[PDB]
Structure 1
């Protein structure tokens, strides 16, 4: 960690601490150093409470800037490219424990974003595009909702069968929810008639279910197919009551 001669440690939003000198230097400013992700950042501020701006250079020459607001209520951590201006990442963190993490692209535009709310739930956007669209994920206490982002709204989706539930979050943070059900057509009973055999073959779900035979003795028999609709099983049973015909039509 960080060490300073005649200093005081000050706790900061989002894990961080800064050391600030007990006294002022030759110019009246106070010395600040902090250690973030094993990199030492340093600066001078007119204030002596821990606020100000600290800077450091990574071993790959990336520039790191930590800005601490006057009231110590917010830290901004920025990582830049070598040039010191093309952003790579930006993390704004608050005392209430809320935060925004952005990652940037070659064009100087945001391509990922993690929003952490005070209560510990998060919204994660990945793969953000020029048109504002992207993948989306809400992390909640005990589970995760998946969906996508457009320029206008985030749409989280849960599926059960033909039922779709959509949670929409607007740019203001307003929730609205919708539901859709596209149920399949129900199982319909069709039939084909063989006049050579005087037989009606009934079908459901592309499986043959039963044969009704209309006999030369003016009787009806019923016989079931195997539950694969492949071929007949048992023997033909003769119909003696109207109710038995209705039953075979169920």
Structure 2
């Protein structure tokens, strides 16, 4: 009498096989221990469902028309102000937000399809906060502002910064307080190839590639400072980034 549909974000909805006299389908969904119910124009699992937690919190689940997006929202008991919101997008990334007493976002966790994460905590009304990127094998720590996320690794006199612009573009910069032209590191960012080239005393030393799989590779140049040698190695721990900056 009804069709079961699996939903992005580990949920499931039951849909009536045929519509009522208003043309609408009934929906019942299970979300952890909670039962939600609602209606829809389609028979495919899309629609809007509501329920109440044992503590009187209102819950709403919205499923996009194409079943590609789900939004799970938790509100205060009068349903007026958000407490939490989780969205799973069609690219299988996820965004989880918490809201403070006045219902402003105070935390946002973005989980990429590969499981790497951007964690923003202590978010203030100007969109500043603490930031952390969780990669495979290591974590990069830094700050958030409404202009950019800045993740930082330090080694000796060298500071490496991974900046993620507000629109999501990446740029990497290298600062070095070393004043000796023979050993001081400088670096050039090639936005086209996602590659940071480090130079010491007018010779290239290493390429750091920031890949679209959210990994970092390092490859050394020959003694000539002009040709790459060997093959790039994938960073698996923060110590290897620090070693690259020596």
After TM superposition, the score normalised by the length of structure 2 is 0.69
Task: Flag the 1:69–1:198 CA change in 2: closer, same or farther, 3 A.
Answer: closer
Deviation string 1:177-226 (CA, Å, 9 cap, x unpaired) is 112223xxxxx999999999999999999999999999999999999999
Runs of 4+ in structure 1 over 4 Å off: 188-250
Q: 1:216 to 1:17 in 2, by over 3 A?
A: closer
Number of the residue aligned with 1:3: none
Q: Does 1:177 pair with 2:172?
A: yes
Partner of 2:192: 196
Alpha carbons of 1:166 and 1:238: their partners in 2 closer, same or farther (altered >3 Å)? closer
Q: How big is the shift at 1:17? A: 1.4
Q: For 1:243, what is the secondary structure of its paired residue?
A: helix
Greater RCO, 1 or 2 (C-alpha within 8 Å, sep 6+): 2
State the SS of the aligned residue for 1:102.
strand
Secondary structure of the corresponding residue to residue 244 of structure 2: helix
Aligned CA distance change for structure 1 residues 45 and 177 (closer, same or farther; 3 Å) = same
In structure 2, runs of 5+ residues without a counterpart are 178-183
| Shift in CA distance, 201/177, structure 1 to aligned 2, threshold 3 Å | closer
TM-aligned CA deviation for residue 176 of structure 1: 1.0
Partner of residue 76 from structure 1, selected from 71, 74, 78: 71
Q: Name the TM-score, length of structure 1 as normaliser.
A: 0.68
Partner Cα separation in structure 2 for residue 236 and residue 75 of structure 1: 39
* Distance change (3 Å), C-alpha of 1:26 and 1:175: same
- Whether the aligned pair in 2 keeps the contact of 1:14 and 1:95 (CA below 8 Å) is no
Asked if 2 retains the 8 angstrom alpha-carbon contact of 1:32 and 1:43, the reply is yes
Shift of 1:239: 53
Q: How many residues align structurally?
A: 240
- TM-aligned CA deviation for residue 228 of structure 1: 42
Q: Could you tell me how far apart the structure 2 residues matched to 1:171 and 1:217 are?
A: 20
- Deviation per residue, 1:1-29 (Å, 9 max, x gap): xxxxx211111112111110123335432
Distance apart, 1:153 and its partner CA: 0.6
Instruction: Note the residue ranges of structure 1 that are not aligned, 5 or more in a row.
Output: 1-5, 183-187
Distance in 1 (alpha carbons) for counterparts of 2:42 and 2:207: 94
SS of the residue aligned with 1:233? coil
What do you get for the CA RMSD once the two structures are aligned? 19.9
Matched, 1:221 2:217: yes
Structure 2 CA distance for aligned equivalents of residues 220 and 68 of structure 1 = 36
Measured against aligned partners, the alpha-carbon deviations of 1:109-149 in whole angstroms (never above 9, x if no partner) come to 11101112233221110000122211101111221111110
Alpha carbons of structure 1 residues 48 and 160: separation in structure 2 relative to 1, 3 Å:
same
CA–CA distance in structure 1, aligned partners of residues 77 and 208 of structure 2: 84
> What is the CA distance between 1:240 and its match in structure 2?
56
